[PDB]
Amino acid sequence: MRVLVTGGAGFIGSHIVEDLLARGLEVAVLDNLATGKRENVPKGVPFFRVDLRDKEGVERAFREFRPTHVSHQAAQASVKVSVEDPVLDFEVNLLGGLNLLEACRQYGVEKLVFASTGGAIYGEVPEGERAEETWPPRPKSPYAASKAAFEHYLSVYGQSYGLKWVSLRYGNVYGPRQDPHGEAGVVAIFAERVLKGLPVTLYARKTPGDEGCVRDYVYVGDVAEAHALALFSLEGIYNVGTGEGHTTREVLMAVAEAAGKAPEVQPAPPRPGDLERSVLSPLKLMAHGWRPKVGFQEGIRLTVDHFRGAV
Ligand SMILES: NC(=O)c1ccc[n+]([C@@H]2O[C@H](COP(=O)([O-])OP(=O)(O)OC[C@H]3O[C@@H](n4cnc5c(N)ncnc54)[C@H](O)[C@@H]3O)[C@@H](O)[C@H]2O)c1
NAD-dependent epimerase/dehydratase domain: which residues (predicted)? Predict the structure, then answer.
């Protein structure tokens, strides 16, 4: 099996590359380094410094590497950026995505595994409930629209052309090598600021001083494992979440514990157009044997250590 990982120089992408290499697979990376780092790509892994919006460059990567499978992690992956720059989000996530699908058809790729988003696709998840894969998309931002739209394209490419596909709707993915810009960016923000002894802003869920918003935090190593399972054996839509929510206050407490510091917390009103609660139903994926191996406290500890370990 020869796997091309778009966005493989990025946070989730680099963990996927390492995971796949440890399963005897030939792996290549396609990445324009917009946010990814050349240093994240292991020695000996073919690296195509290519923008997915450059059809001729995508074609070159396919010709040179000859992938059998494609893992599509490359994206404009900041909700904020998408609201302030919907055209960039569209060009990268849809136009770039489509160039990739067209190369997949041309080269007879056997499966495309897509990084989708549970947080941005499902909308508000009521108390007591967990978003399930049959819930209808309720996109609120351009990022959500481009991800939802790309899933429609995967479905129509499967139906029309026979391209097999899986859409992994990730929860809030955190861990070593993450930046502060993705859906679980708060983990990096808190880790860096708590370590530096800077005040942290705790945005309210509804009232300044409350516990803050609820998300399904899933450790990046556990996401990489779900990705391998998906690649080998799955088709269709699967949530990749723990099925348990944590509040922003709980994240801060875990970061403080791991850093061994008592941070200065400053409450703020809710950030406008942020979800109060998102928790994903993990049942569909867990029926195929996947479970998080790394608990929340342990994962936060591992993330903090990574931020401590720079020079
Ligand atoms: N909490 C999360 O981090 C989260 C949650 C849900 C879904 N996702 C999705 O997972 C995937 C990976 O996210 P991440 O957190 O690792 O972010 P990331 O920015 O670290 O990784 C994305 C990679 O894509 C590359 N890239 C961006 N635009 C490109 C382009 N036009 N052509 C080629 N490469 C390009 C970047 O350089 C980067 O290395 C994304 O699709 C993202 O939307 C992330």
Answer: 3-241
Residue 98's identity, in one-letter code, is L
The residue whose C-alpha atom lies closest to atom 12 belonging to ligand 1 is 73
Is the distance from the beta carbon of residue 52 to the nearest atom of ligand 1 less than 6 Å? yes
Pocket test for ligand 1, best of 6, 168, 173 (most atoms within 8 A of CB): 173
Helices (H), the chain: 11-21, 55-65, 79-84, 86-90, 97-106, 118-122, 142-161, 185-196, 220-233, 248-259, 283-286, 296-308
- Closest ligand 1 atom to the C-alpha of 93? 31
Residues of the chain with CATH 3.90.25.10: 175-215+242-311
Resolution in A: 1.9
Tell me which architecture the domain covering 175-215+242-311 has in CATH. Alpha-Beta Complex (3.90)
Closest ligand 1 atom, residue 9 Cα = 39
**Amino acid symbol at 87:** V
Give span(s): CATH 3.40.50.720, the chain.
1-174+216-241
The residues assigned a catalytic role are 143
CATH architecture of 1-174+216-241: 3-Layer(aba) Sandwich (3.40)
Q: How was this structure determined?
A: X-ray
